[PDB]
A paper describes a structure:
In Escherichia coli, cytotoxic DNA methyl lesions on the N1 position of purines and N3 position of pyrimidines are primarily repaired by the 2-oxoglutarate (2-OG) iron(II) dependent dioxygenase, AlkB. AlkB is a member of the iron(II) dependent 2-oxoglutarate (2-OG) dioxygenase superfamily that couples decarboxylation of 2-OG to succinate to oxidation of methylation damage primarily in the form of 1-methyladenine (1-meA) and 3-methylcytosine (3-meC) upon binding of dioxygen to the iron(II) cofactor. The AlkB enzyme recognizes and repairs other alkylated DNA lesions such as 3-methylthymine (3-meT), 1-methylguanine (1-meG), and 1,N6-ethenoadenine (εA), albeit with lower efficiency. AlkB repairs methylated DNA damage in ssDNA much more efficiently than in duplex DNA and displays significantly different activity on structurally similar methylated bases.
Here we present the structures of the full length E. coli D135A AlkB in complex with ssDNA containing a 1-meG lesion and the unliganded wild-type AlkB holoenzyme. We determined the structure of the full length E. coli AlkB protein in complex with a 17-mer ssDNA oligonucleotide containing a 1-meG lesion to 2.2 Å resolution and the structure of the AlkB holoenzyme in the absence of nucleotide substrate to 2.9 Å resolution. The protein was crystallized under aerobic conditions in complex with 2-OG and cobalt(II) as the metal ion. The use of cobalt supports DNA binding but prevents catalytic activity. Greater insight into DNA binding and substrate base recognition comes from a comparison of the AlkB-ssDNA complex with the AlkB holoenzyme structure. The hydroxyl side chain of T51 is positioned to make hydrogen bonding interactions with the backbone amide nitrogen of residue Y55 to stabilize the conformation of the T51-Y55 loop. Superposition of our structures of the AlkB-ssDNA complex with the unliganded AlkB proteins (core r.m.s.d = 0.772 Å) reveals little difference structurally in the global conformation of the proteins. Instead, our data indicate that AlkB is a fairly rigid molecule, and the flexibility and dynamics of the nucleotide recognition lid is more localized to residues Y76 and the T51-Y55 loop and not the whole domain, although we cannot rule out movement of this domain during intermediate DNA binding steps. Our comparison of nucleic acid bound and unliganded structures reveals that residue Y76 undergoes a conformational change upon DNA binding necessary for damaged bases to bind in the active site and subsequent catalysis.
Residue numbers in the entry: 12 to 214
Amino acid sequence: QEPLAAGAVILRRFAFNAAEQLIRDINDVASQSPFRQMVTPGGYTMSVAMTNCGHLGWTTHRQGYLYSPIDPQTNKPWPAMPQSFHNLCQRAATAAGYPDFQPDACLINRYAPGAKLSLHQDKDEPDLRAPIVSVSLGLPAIFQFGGLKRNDPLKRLLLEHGDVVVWGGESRLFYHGIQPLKAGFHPLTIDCRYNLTFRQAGK
Ligand SMILES: O=C(O)CCC(=O)C(=O)O
Ligand SMILES: [Co+2]
């Protein structure tokens, strides 16, 4: 299935089949670059653990964000993006109408019950030409999606295991975020939610 909105679609239950292989390749990456909490420059500490794969990796600190080839926690390169991450990503991107997308970054998020991503706009990328591909894995989450300005009426959507969201073009600098993840069980993730966001950061 494929719905909305405006240079952005939801590919519903798109990563369903590959979820077992994604989870496995998430784990493989994690055994190299582990998950960790990150302190926002505003002093707040994020309830979302995260790590990276691909050419570039995004981390926030006290001075601010950074895209890096080096993992600041290991002082070695971020794991190469797994075959299945790459394949899945462009297969989503094509179906979303971005045939010439190729990411170099992949920020992997892990949410516990009560974890939240504050409303933000994917901003720290120089090349606004490329779209964002978000993969939802595990427990269901409510993903809010507004627009350019902060005050745009947000719309609340249930993102479920396998669900995929691609946004770019006119909808690229759009405010979006995550509400406190409700507790539950999922076969594959047990009691959490994984989320991959694919991005072009270099080029
Ligand atoms: O968990 C999500 O679906 C949101 C991910 C996101 O927007 C980000 O990593 O910047
Ligand atoms: Co984002």
